[PDB]
C-alpha cells in the first residue's frame, strides 16, 4: 500500500492540475518518489507542467 | 589488456567531472557516429588494463521515445562495444537517478555503480544496496580524489552481474514480451530480447527498429493486452518505480 503510477494519473484524472506537493501528501507517499514519477510520466507523454508554482496535468 | 568501459548516468550528476579525475590529461573528442554532438574518450591506466573510457551523453533512462541522448547510448549499450560500464548514480534523487540503473542491470551487461557526491550527503546503507543490484558499489568523495581508486580497482575485477529478479512485472505483460522475444533473430543473445520485448511495449523506438522483423508484431501484442492492462506502457514504468521504492527505503 504505497503510490503507484497509476495511482497518479488517476489521482490528476480527477482533481486536473495539482501540486506535487499536494500529490506527495495526499497519496501517502515520500514526496521525492512522486517528484520523479511525474518527471517520467511527463516524458513519457502522460503528464504535463505549468508555471508563473509547479502544476501538474494530463496529456500530450 | 586494454579495456573498453561506457561511462553512463544521469544529467546533472558530476559524470563530466567523474570522467575527468579518472582520465584528466588524456582527453580527445570526436563527432559522434555520423551526427553534430560530441563523442569524448579518455584514457586512462589500472595497475591491470589501459582503459578506454567512454563517455556517454547524460539520460535519466534509455526508453527512446527526437531527444537522441537515450538512443545514443541504447545504441553504444548493445552494440556490444563496451567491454562494461560504469553507471554514475547521485545519492540526493536516488529515486530519479534509478530508473537507468534498473534498465542498465536489466540488460544484463557488467556494470559498476559510482555513487557520487557523497559530501552533498547523512549516510546510507550501501553494501545492502549493491546486493539488491547484484553489481558492485563504489562510493565516492571526489573532491578528495578519495574513492576513485577503489572504482579504478573495481573496473578490474569484475566479471558479470549477479543474476537476481530486479524488478517483479505482472505476468501478463511478460508472457506477451517474451513472445515478442521468439520472433527476433538469436543472433541477439537470450537475455536482451527478453528486455528488447519490453522496451518495444513501453514506447521504445530504437529497440522498434533494433527488433526488426518482429516489430509488425508488436501491435497485434499490445492489442491482446488492452483487454486485461489499461495502458501497458505504465505498467512497465511503474513496476520498475516499485522496486525502485523498494530499495530506497530498504537503504535509508
Redesign the interface.
Same mark, same amino acid.
Do not use: F, V, W
Given at each position: 500500500s504505497?503510490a503507484?503510477?497509476?495511482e497518479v494519473?488517476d489521482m490528476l484524472a480527477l482533481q486536473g492540475r495539482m501540486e506535487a506537493k499536494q500529490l506527495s501528501a495526499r497519496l501517502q507517499t515520500?514526496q521525492?518518489?512522486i517528484?520523479?514519477?511525474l518527471?517520467?510520466?511527463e516524458?513519457?507523454?502522460?503528464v504535463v507542467r505549468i508555471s508563473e508554482q509547479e502544476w501538474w496535468a494530463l496529456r500530450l | 589488456q586494454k579495456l573498453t568501459v561506457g561511462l553512463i548516468g544521469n544529467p546533472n550528476s558530476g559524470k563530466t567531472t567523474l570522467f575527468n579525475q579518472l582520465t584528466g590529461a588524456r582527453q580527445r573528442v570526436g563527432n559522434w557516429a555520423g551526427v553534430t554532438v560530441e563523442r569524448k574518450e579518455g584514457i586512462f591506466a589500472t595497475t591491470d588494463h589501459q582503459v578506454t573510457l567512454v563517455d556517454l551523453p547524460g539520460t +535519466?533512462?534509455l526508453?527512446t521515445?527526437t531527444?537522441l541522448d537515450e538512443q545514443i547510448a541504447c545504441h553504444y549499450i548493445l552494440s556490444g562495444d563496451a567491454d562494461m560500464l560504469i553507471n554514475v548514480v547521485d545519492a540526493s534523487? !536516488?529515486?530519479?537517478n534509478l +530508473?537507468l540503473t534498473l534498465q542498465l542491470l536489466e540488460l544484463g551487461i557488467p556494470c559498476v555503480v559510482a555513487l557520487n557526491m557523497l559530501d552533498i550527503a547523512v549516510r546510507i546503507d550501501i553494501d545492502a544496496l549493491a546486493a539488491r543490484l547484484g553489481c558492485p558499489v563504489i562510493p565516492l568523495v571526489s573532491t578528495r580524489g578519495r574513492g576513485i581508486e577503489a572504482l579504478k580497482i573495481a573496473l578490474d575485477r569484475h566479471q558479470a552481474n549477479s543474476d537476481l529478479e530486479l524488478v517483479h512485472y505482472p505476468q501478463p505483460l511478460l508472457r506477451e514480451a517474451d513472445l515478442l522475444a521468439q520472433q527476433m533473430s538469436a543472433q541477439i543473445p537470450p537475455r536482451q530480447r527478453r528486455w528488447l520485448g519490453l522496451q518495444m511495449l513501453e514506447?521504445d523506438i530504437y529497440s522498434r527498429a533494433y527488433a526488426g522483423d518482429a516489430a509488425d508484431k508488436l501491435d497485434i501484442a499490445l492489442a491482446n493486452l488492452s483487454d486485461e492492462i489499461?495502458?501497458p506502457? !505504465?505498467?512497465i514504468?511503474?513496476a520498475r +518505480?516499485?522496486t525502485?521504492?523498494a530499495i530506497?527505503d530498504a537503504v535509508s
Open positions: 504505497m503507484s503510477l497509476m494519473r515520500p521525492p518518489l517528484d520523479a514519477m518527471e517520467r510520466m516524458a513519457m507523454g502522460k | +535519466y533512462s526508453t521515445i531527444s534523487n !536516488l529515486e530519479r +530508473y514506447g489499461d495502458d506502457a !505504465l505498467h514504468a511503474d +518505480y516499485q525502485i521504492a530506497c
